[PDB]
């Protein structure tokens, strides 16, 4: 399937 | 039956609208990473400056 | 079918973001590791 970002907002490692 | 064929066209439409706005989500996500990353570079620049003195 | 095509292009770019994202995350972790090392330095 299509893959989206792990969140809608950037979360640093 | 023909139910399977109709459902697949809905399903295929589902996927495209899901894929399209997923890439749009990527744009926003990555823009925020750039902000975070330029911040880190500014922080490194000040730490390097501090470890020189 | 035209909708069939752009579904593939959507998924293609989607794959290009994915690999690009992996590279960027390695880069972010590298900066954080550098900061860690710098903060460890002084300190002492």
Å between C41 CA and nearest CA of chain A:
22
Tell me the residue length of chain A. 13
CATH topology of domain C1-44: 1.20.5
Look at the block and give the residue holding tokens 């880069």.
Answer: C27
For chain B, the domains span 1-53
Asked whether the beta carbons of C4 and B13 are under 8 A apart, the reply is: no
Instruction: Copy the structure tokens of residue B10.
Output: 């809905």
Interface check B18 vs C, CB under 8 A: no
Q: Write the residue in C11, C21, C29 that is nearest to A2 by C-beta.
A: C11
- Residue C43, Ramachandran bin (φ over 0: left; ψ between -120 and 50: alpha; else beta): left
One DSSP character per residue, C10-43 reads: HHHHHHHHHHHHHHHHHHHHHHHHHHHHHHHHTT
**Euclidean distance between CA atoms B43 and C37, whole angstroms:** 13
- Would you state the CATH architecture of domain B1-53? Up-down Bundle (1.20)
Q: What is the CA radius of gyration of chain B?
A: 23
Contact B16 C24 (CB under 8 A): no
Instruction: Copy the structure tokens of residue C17.
Output: 């973001």
Interface check A13 vs B, CB under 8 A: no
**Euclidean distance between CA atoms C44 and C39, whole angstroms:** 9
- B43 exposure class (CB count in 10 Å sphere: 0-12, 13-18, 19+): middle
Look at residues C38, A6, A5 and name the one whose alpha carbon lies nearest to residue B41: C38
Asked whether the beta carbons of C38 and B48 are under 8 A apart, the reply is: yes
Cis, bond preceding A12 (omega within 30 deg of 0):
no
Contact A4 B36 (CB under 8 A): no
Q: Write the residue in A2, A7, A10 that is nearest to B19 by C-beta.
A: A2
**Euclidean distance between CA atoms B48 and C3, whole angstroms:** 53
* DSSP 3-state of B22: helix
């Amino acid at each position: 399937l299509a893959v989206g970002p792990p969140s809608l907002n950037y979360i640093p490692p | 039956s023909f139910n399977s064929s109709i459902n697949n066209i809905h399903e295929m439409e589902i996927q495209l609208k899901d894929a399209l706005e997923k890439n749009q989500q990527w744009l926003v996500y990555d823009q925020q990473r750039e902000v975070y990353v330029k911040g880190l570079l500014a922080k490194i620049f000040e730490l390097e400056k501090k470890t020189e003195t």
